[PDB]
Amino acid sequence: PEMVRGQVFDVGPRYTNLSYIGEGAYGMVCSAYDNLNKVRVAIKKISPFEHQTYCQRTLREIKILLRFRHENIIGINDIIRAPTIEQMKDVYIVQDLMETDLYKLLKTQHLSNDHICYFLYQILRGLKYIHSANVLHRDLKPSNLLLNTTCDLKICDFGLARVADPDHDHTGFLTEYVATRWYRAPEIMLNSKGYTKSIDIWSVGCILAEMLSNRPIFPGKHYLDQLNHILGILGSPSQEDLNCIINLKARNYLLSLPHKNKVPWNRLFPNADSKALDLLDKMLTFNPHKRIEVEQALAHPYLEQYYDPSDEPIAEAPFKFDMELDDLPKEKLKELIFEETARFQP
Numbered sequence: 001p002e003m004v005r006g007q008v009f010d011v012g013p014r015y016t017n018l019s020y021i022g023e024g025a026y027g028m029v030c031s032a033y034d035n036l037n038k039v040r041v042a043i044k045k046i047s048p049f050e051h052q053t054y055c056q057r058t059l060r061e062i063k064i065l066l067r068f069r070h071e072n073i074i075g076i077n078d079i080i081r082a083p084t085i086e087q088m089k090d091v092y093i094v095q096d097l098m099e100t101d102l103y104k105l106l107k108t109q110h111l112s113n114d115h116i117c118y119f120l121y122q123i124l125r126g127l128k129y130i131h132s133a134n135v136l137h138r139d140l141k142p143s144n145l146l147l148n149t150t151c152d153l154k155i156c157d158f159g160l161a162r163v164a165d166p167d168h169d170h171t172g173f174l175t176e177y178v179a180t181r182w183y184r185a186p187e188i189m190l191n192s193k194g195y196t197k198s199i200d201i202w203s204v205g206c207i208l209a210e211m212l213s214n215r216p217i218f219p220g221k222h223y224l225d226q227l228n229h230i231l232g233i234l235g236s237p238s239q240e241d242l243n244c245i246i247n248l249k250a251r252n253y254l255l256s257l258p259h260k261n262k263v264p265w266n267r268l269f270p271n272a273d274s275k276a277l278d279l280l281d282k283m284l285t286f287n288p289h290k291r292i293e294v295e296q297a298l299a300h301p302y303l304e305q306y307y308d309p310s311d312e313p314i315a316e317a318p319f320k321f322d323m324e325l326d327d328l329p330k331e332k333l334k335e336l337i338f339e340e341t342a343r344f345q346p
């Protein structure tokens with residue numbers, strides 16, 4: 001098999017002339033030439049089978065992406081694995097080769113207002129389809145937003161996604177860890193399992209703020225610091241928003257804090273389009289029930305040049321219920337992964 005950096009990268013003979021590209025979460029990512037379609041592709045190597053939680057993430061991404069088809073979501077072109085469960089140790093997922101991601105871009109490139117508008121439109125157009133499938137992405141951040149050379153945007157990584165479950169979303173104070181820290185909504189730390197669509201809208205708001213200045217808006221230094229950053233800019237929640245939080249440990253924590261004023265967005269972002277700051281404010285609303293939803297966001301004046309509901313499709317086949325992947329041992333999960341990837345043999 002072909003090696004890359006001393007690791008087996010066993011993809012041939014269809015995919016040749018490998019090049020290292022970066023690191024996934026269960027392994028390496030390489031570019032390669034597809035000798036059938038005659039284009040270069042991205043290939044991520046997955047090694048999940050020693051661990052039940054790794055298998056869960058791998059199965060979840062495969063089941064979702066094999067159902068989804070959308071311009072702003074990076075699909076699965078092919079899956080490579082051994083012909084038998086016994087011999088299958090790794091799984092390689094083949095996707096479109098993109099040019100960069102939003103994390104890498106924001107390190108060095110200032111975005112024009114027109115680019116911010118286009119990127120944000122594409123994120124919301126993809127999110128609309130995801131949410132219409134009754135799916136939460138749950139880890140939206142700049143590095144999961146890929147761009148090609150003409151700035152077409154695609155959403156990466158459904159390994160952390162869940163079927164939405166708003167009726168079972170309430171929980172206790174400081175017990176949940178959903179999403180990546182800087183993009184994690186305040187109610188995660190307060191009283192939410194992250195099972196409602198508003199979790200993703202918060203992350204998008206964080207992404208828009210970062211697009212506006214090239215700096216993460218709420219840069220918490222560790223899990224507990226994050227709420228400090230959110231409240232230091234949003235200010236103290238209203239009585240009405242606190243009356244929304246029935247959990248006493250959460251509400252009393254917030255009540256125990258000194259009053260903090262809201263920092264005006266146009267003071268944080270004096271260069272920004274006023275329509276963008278209005279939409280930003282609506283995505284970064286403290287109360288998740290008041291936070292704007294994906295279809296309202298697409299309709300916001302800021303996006304008026306792009307908005308076209310008939311060109312903003314939804315999912316044919318929404319996921320009706322939870323996958324019920326918890327409790328399944330990893331042996332069962334391997335067999336499910338094997339089964340789900342059979343359609344790409346030989």
Ligand SMILES: *[C@H]1CC(=O)[C@@H](O)[C@@H](O)CCCCc2cc(OCOCC)cc(O)c2C(=O)O[C@@H](C)C1
Pocket residue numbers: 021022023024029031042043044095096097098099100101143144145146156157
């Ligand atoms: C999506 C997630 C992602 O991009 C980040 O988690 C990233 O750090 C993972 C490793 C690199 C992914 C990547 C890099 C690319 O660079 C292209 O250079 C040659 C033009 C291109 C692509 O397409 C990807 C990519 O598809 O990714 C997916 C697999 C993961």
